[PDB]
Amino acid sequence: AKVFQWFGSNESGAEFGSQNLPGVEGKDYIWPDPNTIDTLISKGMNIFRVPFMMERLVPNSMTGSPDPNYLADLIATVNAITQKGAYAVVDPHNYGRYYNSIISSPSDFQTFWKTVASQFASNPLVIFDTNNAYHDMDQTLVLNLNQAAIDGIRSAGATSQYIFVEGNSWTGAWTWTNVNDNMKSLTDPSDKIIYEMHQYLDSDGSGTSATCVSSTIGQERITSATQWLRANGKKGIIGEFAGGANDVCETAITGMLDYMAQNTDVWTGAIWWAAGPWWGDYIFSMEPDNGIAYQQILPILTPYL
Numbered sequence: 001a002k003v004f005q006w007f008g009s010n011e012s013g014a015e016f017g018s019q020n021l022p023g024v025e026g027k028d029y030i031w032p033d034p035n036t037i038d039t040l041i042s043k044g045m046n047i048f049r050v051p052f053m054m055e056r057l058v059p060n061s062m063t064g065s066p067d068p069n070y071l072a073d074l075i076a077t078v079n080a081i082t083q084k085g086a087y088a089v090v091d092p093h094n095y096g097r098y099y100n101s102i103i104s105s106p107s108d109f110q111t112f113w114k115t116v117a118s119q120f121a122s123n124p125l126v127i128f129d130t131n132n133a134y135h136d137m138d139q140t141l142v143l144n145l146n147q148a149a150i151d152g153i154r155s156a157g158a159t160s161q162y163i164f165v166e167g168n169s170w171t172g173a174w175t176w177t178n179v180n181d182n183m184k185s186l187t188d189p190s191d192k193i194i195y196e197m198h199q200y201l202d203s204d205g206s207g208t209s210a211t212c213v214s215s216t217i218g219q220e221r222i223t224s225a226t227q228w229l230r231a232n233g234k235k236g237i238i239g240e241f242a243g244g245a246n247d248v249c250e251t252a253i254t255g256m257l258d259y260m261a262q263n264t265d266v267w268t269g270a271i272w273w274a275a276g277p278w279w280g281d282y283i284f285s286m287e288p289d290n291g292i293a294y295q296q297i298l299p300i301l302t303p304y305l
């Protein structure tokens with residue numbers, strides 16, 4: 001059932017092997033497979049988030065020219081998604097950092113975002129994601145970086161697209177109200193800001209263990225974020241979530257999605273972490289046809305597709 005505006009999967013791989021910059025395609029990183037994206041589209045997903053490294057797209061200086069090969073493959077991936085009618089989220093998977101240093105220049109970040117947005121300005125099914133999971137950095141800077149991204153995107157004439165903004169504390173939903181209240185002041189002339197939060201279900205919320213705290217931990221961890229969105233007249237998306245292929249996690253996943261389904265005045269949907277071609281036996285692999293989550297979790301996501 002078409003419960004949410006957006007329901008889909010991350011398509012990870014282009015950000016793999018980040019210790020090697022620029023690194024080598026086919027050895028350090030790989031782009032998503034359009035054929036397996038088609039399969040997930042056939043299952044009813046309509047949004048695919050595509051991580052990539054800023055340093056690989058725009059080397060040495062974020063204000064510089066794109067790397068032709070890496071950009072060409074980003075373009076190809078985005079077009080493979082949007083040509084089918086689905087939404088493609090362009091996600092610089094960079095944690096608010098560039099060459100492992102916090103991005104402290106909003107002006108530099110705005111130029112980076114004009115450069116990226118210019119490549120996709122006429123495509124209304126592209127979604128721009130300012131940066132993945134800002135963390136351990138100045139709270140006002142996170143606000144200013146998100147605004148600079150919005151400004152750069154709209155300055156390129158990319159005005160039809162939604163913009164996913166992300167907050168501090170790894171943009172966690174469960175930590176949102178404790179640190180990210182200032183994010184309410186972001187402005188967009190297109191009025192298409194979506195607050196992208198992430199929520200994992202293991203004890204520390206890192207999403208590194210297949211064990212979930214309890215059968216209700218997901219719905220508990222997004223309640224205050226839901227109220228924050230409603231109180232501030234904002235819209236949100238869960239841009240990453242996952243749980244292990246086990247009984248407790250299946251119930252936590254459905255409980256949290258069932259809760260968002262009764263709160264769609266603020267929740268636009270949810271995006272699983274993650275599919276992609278190099279996950280192998282990853283505990284959360286949504287990659288068709290043999291990913292653990294593709295085999296064992298996707299059946300419980302049927303009511304939302």
Ligand SMILES: OC[C@H]1O[C@@H](O[C@H]2[C@H](O)[C@@H](O)[C@H](O[C@H]3[C@H](O)[C@@H](O)[C@H](O[C@H]4[C@H](O)[C@@H](O)[C@H](O[C@H]5[C@H](O)[C@@H](O)[C@H](O)O[C@@H]5CO)O[C@@H]4CO)O[C@@H]3CO)O[C@@H]2CO)[C@H](O)[C@@H](O)[C@@H]1O
Nearest residue numbers: 012015016017018026027028029132133170206207208278
């Ligand atoms: O296919 C054959 C091919 O293999 C090449 O070598 C591969 C190797 O086979 C892969 O196992 C390896 O894969 C690892 C990636 O290098 C690494 O980047 C990736 O890191 C993951 C991490 O495991 C995961 O926890 C993390 O999730 C977080 C999100 O990123 C955050 O946004 C969110 O906040 O929290 C979640 C949960 O913590 O994601 C990152 C990626 O973003 O882990 C992979 C598995 O270990 O890659 C090698 C290449 O780099 C070989 O070189 C080729 O020759 C060969 O053909």
